[PDB]
Design a protein around this nucleic acid. Structure first.
Ligand code: ZN
Ligand code: ZN
Ligand code: ZN
Ligand code: ZN
Lengths: 52, 52
DNA sequence: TTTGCAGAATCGATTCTGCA
DNA sequence: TTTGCAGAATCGATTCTGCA
């Protein structure tokens, strides 16, 4: 439950898994319209709303 | 007192002059450290504080 | 009728939390 | 003990406002 990079602590493994993407670079949420990509749903949800 | 581009209205000519930079591209406030540049003082003040 | 500073509000975009 | 959604809080960076 600890980001081995930034040292912050996170309520679950699930989320840690996710939180790591932002160090690792993994961005699995792909935009159906442009090549913008996202490590977390909320961000794609935002991008979709604001640009599409 | 009206931005001829976005149509917003601005309390003075002074500021309009400034506000236009962000359409025109003029960025006259130069960073003494990197090539980052700014149309408004506050922004350079921020950049300076946070990155230098 | 104009110049200015120093901070507020806002914006785009992200990560974290409440609740389920 | 784990998955998830939908929104909060935060972040970096900018433009606008209060006050002088
Ligand atoms: Zn981390
Ligand atoms: Zn897109
Ligand atoms: Zn304008
Ligand atoms: Zn700089």
């Amino acid at each position: 439950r600890e980001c081995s990079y930034c040292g912050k602590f996170f309520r679950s493994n699930y989320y840690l898994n996710i939180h790591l993407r932002t160090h690792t670079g993994e961005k699995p949420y792909k935009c159906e319209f442009c090549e913008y990509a996202a490590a977390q749903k909320t961000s794609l949800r935002y991008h979709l709303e604001r640009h599409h």
